[PDB]
Design a protein around this ligand. Structure first.
Ligand SMILES: *[C@@H]1O[C@H](CO)[C@@H](O)[C@H](O)[C@H]1NC(C)=O
Lengths: 49, 49
């Protein structure tokens, strides 16, 4: 293919991600947000567990 | 999960492993998914002249 051609001739960097889960403990997870640690106030806390 | 504990304590004896309470702290929690049913320890020989 040349730099100047039709529509059906331009390169395309295609990456096909495949999310698959098995019986093994899952390791590929997503990021967990973190808020500010407020002290001396009746608030809610959500730690790891 | 494959849990590993370890607690290094100095001792001085030839044989007849001494008595004493030990507390092995957790070391690693490797997330594996194999069915462990048999194991075999490994050592190191000595080659010399
Ligand atoms: C034992 O093997 C089976 C085979 O499918 C698997 O589902 C199971 O998670 C394995 N158990 C452990 C503790 O690895």
């Amino acid at each position: 293919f040349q730099p100047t051609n039709g529509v059906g001739y331009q390169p395309y960097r295609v990456v096909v991600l495949s999310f698959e889960l098995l019986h093994a403990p899952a390791t590929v997870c997503g990021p967990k947000k973190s808020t500010n640690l407020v002290k001396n106030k009746c608030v809610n806390f959500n730690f790891n567990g | 999960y494959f849990k590993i504990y370890s607690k290094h304590t100095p001792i001085n004896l030839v044989r007849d492993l001494p008595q004493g309470f030990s507390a092995l702290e957790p070391l690693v929690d490797l997330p594996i998914g194999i069915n462990i049913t048999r194991f075999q320890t490994l050592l190191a020989l000595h080659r010399s002249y």
